[PDB]
Design a protein around this ligand. Structure first.
Ligand SMILES: *[C@@H]1O[C@H](CO)[C@@H](O[C@@H]2O[C@H](CO)[C@@H](O[C@@H]3O[C@H](CO[C@H]4O[C@H](CO)[C@@H](O)[C@H](O)[C@@H]4O)[C@@H](O)[C@H](O[C@H]4O[C@H](CO)[C@@H](O)[C@H](O)[C@@H]4O)[C@@H]3O)[C@H](O)[C@H]2NC(C)=O)[C@H](O)[C@H]1NC(C)=O
Ligand SMILES: *[C@@H]1O[C@H](CO)[C@@H](O[C@@H]2O[C@H](CO)[C@@H](O[C@@H]3O[C@H](CO[C@H]4O[C@H](CO)[C@@H](O)[C@H](O)[C@@H]4O)[C@@H](O)[C@H](O[C@H]4O[C@H](CO)[C@@H](O)[C@H](O)[C@@H]4O)[C@@H]3O)[C@H](O)[C@H]2NC(C)=O)[C@H](O)[C@H]1NC(C)=O
Ligand SMILES: *[C@@H]1O[C@H](CO)[C@@H](O[C@@H]2O[C@H](CO)[C@@H](O[C@@H]3O[C@H](CO[C@H]4O[C@H](CO)[C@@H](O)[C@H](O)[C@@H]4O)[C@@H](O)[C@H](O[C@H]4O[C@H](CO)[C@@H](O)[C@H](O)[C@@H]4O)[C@@H]3O)[C@H](O)[C@H]2NC(C)=O)[C@H](O)[C@H]1NC(C)=O
Ligand SMILES: CC(=O)N[C@@H]1[C@@H](O)[C@H](O[C@@H]2O[C@H](CO)[C@H](O)[C@H](O[C@]3(C(=O)O)C[C@H](O)[C@@H](NC(C)=O)[C@H]([C@H](O)[C@H](O)CO)O3)[C@H]2O)[C@@H](CO)O[C@H]1O
Ligand SMILES: CC(=O)N[C@@H]1[C@@H](O)[C@H](O[C@@H]2O[C@H](CO)[C@H](O)[C@H](O[C@]3(C(=O)O)C[C@H](O)[C@@H](NC(C)=O)[C@H]([C@H](O)[C@H](O)CO)O3)[C@H]2O)[C@@H](CO)O[C@H]1O
Ligand SMILES: CC(=O)N[C@@H]1[C@@H](O)[C@H](O[C@@H]2O[C@H](CO)[C@H](O)[C@H](O[C@]3(C(=O)O)C[C@H](O)[C@@H](NC(C)=O)[C@H]([C@H](O)[C@H](O)CO)O3)[C@H]2O)[C@@H](CO)O[C@H]1O
Ligand SMILES: *[C@@H]1O[C@H](CO)[C@@H](O[C@@H]2O[C@H](CO)[C@@H](O[C@@H]3O[C@H](CO)[C@@H](O)[C@H](O)[C@@H]3O)[C@H](O)[C@H]2NC(C)=O)[C@H](O)[C@H]1NC(C)=O
Ligand SMILES: *[C@H]1O[C@H](CO)[C@@H](O[C@@H]2O[C@H](CO)[C@@H](O[C@@H]3O[C@H](CO)[C@@H](O)[C@H](O)[C@@H]3O)[C@H](O)[C@H]2NC(C)=O)[C@H](O)[C@H]1NC(C)=O
Ligand SMILES: *[C@@H]1O[C@H](CO)[C@@H](O[C@@H]2O[C@H](CO)[C@@H](O)[C@H](O)[C@H]2NC(C)=O)[C@H](O)[C@H]1NC(C)=O
Ligand SMILES: *[C@@H]1O[C@H](CO)[C@@H](O[C@@H]2O[C@H](CO)[C@@H](O)[C@H](O)[C@H]2NC(C)=O)[C@H](O)[C@H]1NC(C)=O
Ligand SMILES: *[C@@H]1O[C@H](CO)[C@@H](O[C@@H]2O[C@H](CO)[C@@H](O)[C@H](O)[C@H]2NC(C)=O)[C@H](O)[C@H]1NC(C)=O
Ligand SMILES: *[C@@H]1O[C@H](CO)[C@@H](O[C@@H]2O[C@H](CO)[C@@H](O)[C@H](O)[C@H]2NC(C)=O)[C@H](O)[C@H]1NC(C)=O
Ligand SMILES: *[C@@H]1O[C@H](CO)[C@@H](O)[C@H](O)[C@H]1NC(C)=O
Ligand SMILES: *[C@@H]1O[C@H](CO)[C@@H](O)[C@H](O)[C@H]1NC(C)=O
Lengths: 175, 318, 317, 175, 319, 175
């Protein structure tokens, strides 16, 4: 994908995540855990559902038309009837091919986009207190329980409360 | 510890499926759906639309009144099914522009007929033939009236018929005899003629005498022509011999009606789209079953499979 | 303060409008434009294109020379407007009427050039009470009804095309009502017309018989055409029933056409015409009518399509 | 959209910005202020202008065509004339619907892109001297007057000049 | 130093090229390719498909057996090229619905003829004309049989021919239009002839029309040509009391890839899988702006003469 | 384009890189140098090769059709024959115009994306040890010889090894 998240900086998918399409795994003082992010999952699915109804109108009713199969050889008018159908089928055949490729591209690209957006959303919350590992993982520089992780996932995490603790832990170092 | 690690991710499935994009020929996604209907139902569903099984009869024969097509006499349809083992069993005929009249009748959606009191003074009516058996006896098309000389006369027929209704379709014909001896024997005059006219149009057909290959023991032929009389207009028929006369008219409807060639059986099910291969499902935008369709149908295309991705790229473990 | 804050953003409007994307059925943008013309001007504009109001006359009647269509005698057009009130007033049929009409429509003129045809032994200028010019019996002005002169009806007449263009010749055959009428008008019991060139021929036989009265007449005339190519010659052979041509029509290659409409012509300017009247030109698509002439938007099923001309509109809580 | 700037980390649009499509609001030692960014505004406008002309050729003159209405029942030929016209209208109808969806998706994505680009542009100048607030806002850890704000949105800002002041303000805390 | 600088970047070229996107009318990319074939080969290549030069002969002339078309008697083709210069040189004729027969024969891809033993009792056969010279002497179409009165009789001809093969037969026949009533009674006995050609399922009757026509190649009379397809199991019947121009046999109809094309361009030893009236063209492009008339494996004809598909990133050089 | 890398924060292309499509230039304790990145380059080429084959199926064999040029004027049937052909050509001509605009837009966007993807990849490796100069260039706050730089290009670079050194060089300053 164009964002390089899915099959990019995020190495692989999680088969053990069945509650949603995008989500979280974490390790802290209360062990490890997993949670889905429903807002991201919904944003993807809403775009994917009815995808085709935006382009193709509900199947057309059609009744009497032209003859498309012939038992006798007639010359001129049969040539015309044949050519018209040939032209129609080929133009729709093209439409269908293009549409599939166009929409599939769109799908790959928007799903990849949502992964990146959730990552970015999380990064902006953590401010100075965390570290992007490139794994798609954050290293948080303070004790963060399940109530604390929960607050990140909802978007209520106040970074000022841990800033001092995070600065201590981060700057422990120097040669 | 004194720190935490929070990782972001996405889901994946065990067995995923391949789709095509603008970037890749093949790429694995979590889920996709078929967009091309390639399987038919194997039969024609009798429900939703009104299906009339033609059985042994072509539409044209059902409308001309071929004896073995008498059961179609009062019938109307959304779709008339013509079977490939249908056959004619009346007097040998030809219709110049057969294809167009078949289309007109098909579109109207009925072979229901309305008798009119034509007076044919000086000629004998209800001409019969051994080529056109009504079960046992010699007969003729029910919707056509074959006229011959009465006693020893065939007066120039000059008959009229107004259209006081708010379009009538008239079917009529001319008989081509086999020999000159036959021509005079049936309609005194050595040369016949049929002129069917209205205020706005006219047609004249001269009969052609000669031998033609025996069909059900007959070498003569009937030629069938049609006329459309508008409201306020008036049908006129002038003839000094050889007239195969109309018995009434067919009402012309603007309709959703058509005709289809198929040998697939008719069965009890529901569908909204019919092809020569029988009915098809309706839920996909495209279809590869047949270019010949009737009803609420997916667009026919050359390709037999097209997969629309409905999930993100599938990235399995390692 | 000892610090500063800088926030980035984008504009919004109060008059937002909904459009369709690949991602959403309906989303608000700051601005959109209509891509489908659905409003007509209600009238046909006289300007840009040369419009001929057919009024009481069909294109065919006007070229045949039906007396009440005399005013069209010399007329040319870009587009000829056929009204539904139009009536014939001279009774005929034309096999392949639609084609001849098409050929003339496309040529864009009913301007006629008289030629000196010589018809030895027959009487010319047949008239009829079915075709009144002013007060007296008349006939199509472009056709010449030939009948018996004295007690005989001999015809083998030639006319070469020395010009550098195609000539269109309109001619006909008369179908009388009774055997009595045939011999009275043209001695021979059975007549014929053989119009030929070096490359083609047509023979028509008159069909005798009674037809319904049209303007007091039960007889009919059937009409036919022949195109003569440069260097080719027109030949007309007949021993009865011929409705002779009086000259030729010049076949043009032009932008000319014909259209059925009951909408009025008015002092106005547009580049596209429909049976509903002229329509505006600025939009790519249009839903007014599939019948168009000129520089027209493409006709489509949908009456509205909204093209986004601004970003997603996000007003405050 | 895909970048999640518009209707994303930037919470809403400004109804009181009429100079441009994209821009800045700021609070400093001289009060509050507003200024549009013209390059962004133009970058987007230039892509939206004549968008349709890049795909659909200027409408062309057609003259004598076929007949499309009929007042007589005919059969074979008229079926054909009707089918041909019906085939045509459905194909152009498809075209119009697909094109509008494509172009609108393009418009939404490119306008979102412009917002995001401007954000990144602004971020890259501030370096360590500032802090992404997640709001689409920047906390600048030094006194920055109107001329200094002008310095940022003209792209002539020199972070080295304010680096030492910025570090002092930034690392005031930790407990 | 005590540090390091690592820069990221991308390539660029000197020969940039302008393309069209959805965002920009013209934008410079590193590389692009032409999607529209504009040049033809100036000639028609005869490898790939069997190409037949019609030379002086139209397709119809060749199948009728016009004397100057004799060399085509056994010819087959994938594509038959008709030239402008082609002329007819036999008895003056017309074919009602000429274009369809041309189309039917074109598709069949052959004018090979199979003779049949027709018996024409009581008439004289092999009628000849000065309007149709085979080398030196008067002649006629080699595939037709002009029948006239023998002695002072033209009996009503009643001839039959059964189709016992498994394919459709195409029969070509005609009728003679004399110039005067005097001529009509001199060649045939009756004042008015007729031809009825019938099967079990179809019939045609043509009445001849007397009268003078423009003199073509000496003659003012004419022949009109008609055709009949006889299905396997059916039976051709011909009935005539004068004026018949009888068939000498049948043509075999083939469901094939054959066609006919009008071109004045030379034919040359060459390979290409696509032919236009301007010559052969290349297949490698998706579109072409050479000709709407094509035969073979051809790109799609479009209005535009050039279309550039970008095959590299935006090209951004030094400023 | 949409990512603002190519002709964005990366000032211009390098005409002197014949080696690949994307890559690196560097100055360190061993002088200056240049190398191409093959993974990015290949990722772009793979999307651009056979791009048209995904939409428009290979040219098709077609034989006898309808007549498209005429000597004699005929009316109705010839009107229809011309309209059919006219209709087909206008519709293919539209498909072609749209396809080129479409694929080209895609090509600009994906090549722009690959540049951004490589920058981001490099940024995520260097962690705190480096500075985004806004140039497309990284200020690496430690001694990094050619082997050290190759480890960045191979993606084997361990930031922990150099962290202590980086913190010293970085925080030499303050007023
Ligand atoms: C112009 O030329 C045609 C062709 O020759 C003539 O038409 C033929 O006329 C003959 C005799 O009148 C027809 O005779 C018929 O053929 C029978 C042979 O058996 C069968 O043939 C077919 C095919 O198998 C079957 O469908 C059919 O039912 C037959 O059973 C004859 O046996 C019949 O005639 C009579 O002969 C027997 C004695 O052998 C008697 O006992 C019977 O009474 C029987 O009726 C049968 O009807 C022949 O079919 C015609 N051919 C065609 C193609 O139609 C025209 O007569 C001629 N016209 C002229 C000169 O004006
Ligand atoms: C074959 O059969 C047809 C049909 O029967 C015959 O055609 C009819 O012929 C009769 C006379 O022979 C026609 O009747 C005459 O025509 C006029 C009818 O006009 C109608 O419309 C007008 C509107 O202008 C109305 O006013 C009127 O009521 C009618 O509805 C009348 O005007 C005629 O009257 C005149 O003639 C009589 C003598 O007959 C005089 O005494 C009067 O003073 C007056 O001037 C008259 O009624 C009838 O219209 C024809 N119908 C059609 C459909 O053509 C053929 O004659 C016949 N052919 C044969 C036997 O060869
Ligand atoms: C109905 O009307 C038509 C049209 O007028 C008549 O057809 C014309 O008939 C005349 C008389 O037969 C034809 O004239 C003859 O043409 C022949 C061919 O000449 C053509 O080619 C030469 C070049 O070789 C040109 O010079 C010339 O212009 C022609 O194009 C010639 O063989 C004739 O000339 C010879 O005859 C005289 C004696 O008559 C001899 O001394 C010489 O040998 C001389 O060479 C003559 O010129 C004319 O071509 C016909 N025109 C058309 C258009 O068909 C019908 O005859 C008439 N039918 C009736 C009354 O029933
Ligand atoms: C051994 C033998 O030949 N016996 C004859 C026998 O042929 C003949 O039968 C009649 O033959 C004539 C041929 O001129 C017709 O084919 C008759 O066919 C019928 C038919 O069945 O169709 C009879 C019918 O009653 C006729 N109907 C009318 C309305 O006229 C039609 C019709 O005339 C023709 O089809 C017109 O083309 O023909 C057939 O019976 C008999 C006749 O009595 O005489 C034996 O001696
Ligand atoms: C009630 C009564 O007794 N009426 C008759 C009346 O029929 C007759 O009028 C003539 O009737 C004849 C029919 O035999 C024609 O209808 C005549 O019509 C005209 C016409 O069309 O106007 C006259 C015209 O001069 C003719 N033109 C030519 C070139 O011949 C045409 C022409 O013959 C026909 O149109 C051909 O179809 O016919 C009409 O005058 C009158 C006069 O005899 O006597 C009344 O008593
Ligand atoms: C100057 C002059 O008066 N010359 C005549 C001259 O007319 C005549 O030549 C014959 O004229 C007749 C016309 O009545 C035909 O045109 C003859 O044409 C031929 C032909 O095609 O060459 C002869 C040929 O043998 C005929 N073939 C058959 C099968 O009948 C055909 C045929 O009848 C016509 O083509 C039918 O349309 O016509 C032509 O020879 C000469 C000699 O008779 O006498 C001069 O006085
Ligand atoms: C820029 O890209 C274009 C193509 O978009 C390059 O020109 C073309 O390159 C193709 C593929 O390499 C050539 O195709 C050839 O096909 C034959 C098979 O028939 C094969 O034998 C050859 O080996 C080759 O693959 C094609 O000749 C060529 N087209 C034209 C019109 O020149 C171009 O070289 C690229 N330029 C750069 C600087 O990358
Ligand atoms: C957003 O909505 C529409 C469409 O984007 C804008 O209105 C249109 O803007 C165009 C600019 O090209 C105007 O065209 C004008 O045409 C006249 C000639 O008729 C000419 O004199 C002008 O110089 C100009 O070229 C036109 O006003 C208008 N077109 C329409 C309505 O069809 C609108 O301005 C935009 N609104 C906002 C708030 O930005
Ligand atoms: C994969 O996607 C398909 C198609 O979208 C899913 O089937 C649809 O599920 C919806 C959601 O309730 C139903 O309303 C529809 O009836 C289904 N669509 C069609 C076209 O039949 C399918 O369930 C998904 N499969 C998995 C394993 O997730
Ligand atoms: C269609 O035609 C066939 C054959 O002509 C009819 O089948 C015959 O029916 C009778 C009784 O009605 C049987 O005695 C025969 O054995 C049948 N013949 C054959 C060959 O099967 C059939 O009746 C017709 N179909 C309909 C629906 O009427
Ligand atoms: C077209 O025909 C109409 C109707 O036949 C003509 O209008 C009539 O004109 C006369 C004057 O001669 C009036 O007395 C009538 O009242 C009108 N008739 C009707 C039914 O309204 C009109 O003259 C013709 N149009 C043109 C342009 O000449
Ligand atoms: C086609 O016909 C033309 C003209 O009839 C032929 O050209 C003639 O060639 C022969 C020599 O064989 C001579 O009679 C003349 O010198 C030529 N006549 C003219 C008018 O140029 C040509 O040979 C024919 N072409 C083919 C391929 O058979
Ligand atoms: C409000 O909305 C439209 C966008 O559809 C805009 O063009 C217009 O200028 C706005 N203001 C009005 C109509 O006063
Ligand atoms: C651009 O220049 C190079 C080097 O001379 C050449 O090989 C290449 O084919 C050119 N690009 C084209 C013709 O598209």
């Amino acid at each position: 994908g164009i964002f390089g998240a899915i099959a990019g900086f995020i190495e692989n998918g999680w088969e053990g995540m069945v509650d949603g399409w995008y989500g979280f795994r974490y390790q802290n003082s209360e062990g490890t855990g997993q949670a889905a992010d429903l807002k991201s999952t919904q944003a993807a699915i809403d775009q994917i559902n009815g995808k085709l109804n935006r382009v193709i109108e509900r199947t057309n009713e059609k009744f009497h038309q032209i003859e498309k199969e012939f038992s006798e050889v007639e010359g001129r008018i049969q040539d015309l009837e044949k050519y018209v159908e040939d032209t129609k089928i080929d133009l729709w055949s093209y439409n269908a091919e293009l549409l599939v490729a166009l929409e599939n591209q769109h799908t790959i690209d928007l799903t990849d986009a949502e992964m990146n957006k959730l990552f970015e959303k999380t990064r902006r919350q953590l401010r100075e207190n965390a570290e992007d590992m490139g794994d798609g993982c954050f290293k948080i520089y303070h004790k963060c329980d399940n109530a604390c992780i929960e607050s990140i996932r909802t978007g209520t995490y106040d970074h000022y409360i841990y800033r001092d603790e995070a600065l201590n832990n981060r700057f422990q170092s120097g040669r | 510890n004194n720190t935490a690690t929070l990782c972001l991710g996405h889901h994946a499935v065990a067995n995923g499926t391949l789709v095509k994009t603008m970037s890749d020929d093949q790429i694995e996604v979590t889920n996709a759906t078929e967009l091309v209907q390639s399987i038919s139902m194997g039969k024609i569903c009798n429900k939703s639309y009104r299906i009339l099984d033609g059985r042994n009869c072509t539409l044209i024969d059902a409308m001309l009144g071929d004896p073995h097509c008498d059961a179609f006499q009062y019938e109307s349809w959304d779709l008339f099914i013509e079977r490939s083992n249908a056959f004619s069993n009346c007097y040998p005929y030809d219709i110049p522009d057969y294809a167009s009249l078949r289309s007109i009748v098909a579109s109207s959606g009925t072979v229901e007929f309305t008798a009119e009191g034509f007076t044919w003074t000086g000629v004998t009516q209800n001409g019969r033939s051994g080529a056109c058996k009504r079960g046992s006896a010699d007969s003729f098309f029910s919707r056509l009236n074959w006229l011959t000389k009465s006693g020893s006369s065939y007066p120039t027929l000059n008959v009229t018929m107004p259209n006081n209704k708010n379009d009538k379709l008239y079917i009529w014909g001319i008989h081509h005899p086999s020999s000159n001896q036959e021509q005079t024997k049936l309609y005194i005059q050595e040369s016949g003629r049929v002129t069917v006219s209205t205020k706005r149009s006219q047609q004249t057909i001269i009969p052609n005498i000669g031998s033609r290959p025996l069909v059900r023991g007959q070498s003569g032929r009937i030629s069938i022509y049609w006329t459309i009389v508008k409201p306020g207009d008036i049908l006129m028929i002038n003839s000094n011999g050889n007239l195969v006369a109309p018995r009434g008219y067919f009402k012309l409807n603007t309709g959703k009606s058509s005709v289809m060639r198929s040998d697939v059986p008719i069965d009890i099910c529901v569908s909204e789209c019919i092809t020569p291969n029988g009915s098809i499902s309706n839920d996909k935008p495209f279809q590869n079953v047949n270019k010949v369709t009737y009803g609420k149908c997916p667009k026919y295309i050359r390709q037999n499979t097209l997969k629309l991705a409905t999930g993100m790229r599938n990235v399995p473990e390692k």
